[PDB]
């Protein structure tokens, strides 16, 4: 654009007009893992 797009209100107005586009669970634990805790 003509100006650098930054945190300014001009770019925001332009944008509004239309310019300047914007272990989990026992389900996975194995046989060994299941024994591990119990």
């Amino acid at each position: 654009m003509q100006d650098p797009n930054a945190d300014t209100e001009w770019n925001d107005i332009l944008r509004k007009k239309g310019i300047l586009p914007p272990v989990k669970t026992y389900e996975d634990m194995t046989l060994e893992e299941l024994e591990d805790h119990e």
Binding site: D3, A6, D7, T8, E9, W10, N11, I13, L14
Partner: protein, 538 residues
């Protein structure tokens, strides 16, 4: 539980891109830090050993200078407190013409020391009280430190010795030549009346022959050519017209209404005969040079060539006004021949070629006039702009001396004596004000500190020596630039002096700027605009 929400109230009602800073931590210390960054940006340019900076502005234009106000203007300072310190520096440039870098250095130092005092436990109010009372003491003290005075501003050796200091910080290598030039120019101006106008010193920058080829000209130079065949005149009888060099026409609308072949046959001959009559009346008043602020007509130029009149065309109106002041003429809005009073005179008016440039010179022989020009030669436009800034410093110093002829010792002598005396005053003041008074005093040390740092020596050795010698009783002692080691010498006997008014206004403005920056406690910045800039400043 993974986000801190904005607190109810102002934190939530605030707009999107707006910022709010409050308290010593978010506001005061951040402002002091910004001003410190500014002072650091411009510190290395202070003094004769100050180095130049190459600032490129948003338009890709280049400024090579160690003039503080120029650097600040061409920098895009965006922090508001720094903006305020720069506003103070520009007010110094406007009021006095020299001392902007003092304003910056001193304000930055006062703010740094104010931050220190706030950290030890003082309140901004008490810091401000102490700073203001200490500024009052400094103003009470300064008149007593005045050592010399001008005693004559119609001389050229005394005036050169007086302007040397102001034009030394800028353009250190060649300061006798420039001070001679500026003294010549300043004394040609400055009439028997005590009023001296700095706009009457004109500077023409022509390129290609080194600065030692610069010269003074009692008169005017215009990078123009002549409209006609005549190029030289030895007893100029200038006639000045704000109107074009053409037949006057109607302000409403003009139509040549022909109704007979005879009127058609005679109209053009009548026009030229009218032009011939007009220019011949002008020539018969004795005028050999005509200077018009508007355009020139082909027929009028024809007849000016016929009657041997040199025609000059000045597009600008200020150029025309200054030429009128130069030659003693009056700009006539009609093409009527001038009366004996409306005419101007010059010992010579000629077209020359200074370098690549063609110029029209209105040169008086007398060593006076209402306007004087300094023709600056040089191998670079940037170099010549820097020398023009040095000229502006010298001319503004001459004006300050016309206003107030008092002089204080330079090279840090006044600053060291001020620091000493204000410390001695703060040691007597009881209460919480003494801390701020002593810091205001120590702030003056920033000036000889910057001079020493830039000369290339140990600032602590220099400041200790200066304090020791000023204890022995010598108030005119300051640091020596001409020493590879820390050294000191008599600023007066050396001739390094500053203007009482310069120091007065610099201290006043720097203190006011620091105190203003401190009085801020909350800052509510708005989202940056894309607005087409301020309407009034164009």
């Amino acid at each position: 539980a993974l986000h801190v929400p904005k607190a109810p109230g102002f934190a939530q009602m605030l707009k999107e891109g707006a910022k709010h800073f409050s308290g010593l931590e978010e506001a005061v210390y951040r402002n002091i830090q910004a001003c410190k960054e500014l002072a650091q940006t411009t510190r290395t340019a202070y003094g004769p050993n100050g180095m130049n900076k190459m600032v490129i502005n948003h338009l890709e234009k280049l400024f090579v200078t160690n003039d503080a106000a120029t650097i600040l203007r061409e920098l895009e300072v965006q922090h508001p407190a720094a903006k305020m310190i720069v506003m103070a520096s520009h007010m110094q440039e406007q009021e006095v013409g020299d001392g902007t870098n003092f304003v910056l250095v001193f304000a930055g130092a006062l703010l740094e020391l104010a931050e220190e005092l706030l950290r030890i436990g003082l309140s901004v109010s008490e810091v401000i009280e102490g700073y203001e009372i200490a500024c009052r003491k400094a103003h009470e003290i300064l008149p007593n430190l005045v050592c010399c005075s001008a005693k004559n501003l119609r001389d050229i050796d005394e005036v050169s010795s007086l302007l040397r200091t102001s034009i030394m910080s800028k353009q250190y290598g060649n300061e006798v030549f420039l001070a001679k030039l500026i003294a010549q120019a300043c004394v040609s101006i400055f009439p028997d009346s005590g009023h001296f106008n700095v706009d009457n010193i004109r500077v023409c920058k022509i390129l290609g022959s080194g600065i030692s080829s610069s010269s003074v000209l009692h008169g005017m130079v215009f990078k123009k050519e002549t409209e006609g065949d005549v190029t030289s005149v030895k007893d100029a009888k200038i006639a000045v017209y704000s109107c074009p060099f053409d037949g006057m026409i109607t302000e409403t609308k003009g139509t040549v209404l022909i109704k007979t072949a005879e009127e058609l046959m005679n109209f053009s001959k009548g026009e030229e005969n009218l032009m011939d009559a007009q220019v011949k009346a002008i020539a018969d008043t004795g005028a050999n040079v005509v200077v018009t602020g508007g355009k020139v007509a082909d027929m009028a130029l024809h007849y000016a060539n016929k009657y041997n009149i040199m025609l000059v065309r000045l597009n600008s109106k200020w150029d025309l006004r200054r030429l009128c002041k130069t030659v003693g003429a009056t700009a006539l809005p009609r093409l009527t021949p001038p009366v004996l009073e409306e005419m101007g005179h010059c010992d010579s008016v000629y077209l020359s070629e200074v370098g690549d440039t063609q110029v029209v010179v209105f040169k008086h022989e007398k060593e006076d006039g209402a306007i004087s020009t300094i023709v600056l030669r040089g191998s670079t436009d940037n170099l010549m702009d820097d020398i023009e800034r040095a000229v502006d410093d010298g001319v503004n110093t001459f004006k300050v001396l016309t206003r107030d002829k008092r002089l204080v010792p330079g090279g840090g002598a006044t600053e060291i004596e001020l620091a000493k005396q204000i410390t001695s005053y703060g040691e007597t003041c009881p209460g919480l004000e003494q801390y701020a008074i002593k810091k205001f005093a120590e702030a003056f040390e920033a000036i000889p500190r910057a001079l020493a740092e830039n000369s290339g020596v140990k600032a602590n050795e220099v400041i200790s020596k200066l304090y020791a010698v000023h204890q022995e009783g010598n108030k005119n002692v300051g640091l020596d630039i001409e020493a590879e080691v820390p050294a000191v010498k008599d600023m007066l006997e050396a001739g390094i002096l500053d203007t009482y008014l310069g120091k007065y206004w610099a201290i006043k403005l720097a203190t006011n700027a620091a105190v203003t920056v401190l009085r801020v406690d909350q800052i509510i910045m708005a989202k940056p605009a894309g607005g087409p800039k301020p309407p009034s400043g164009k």
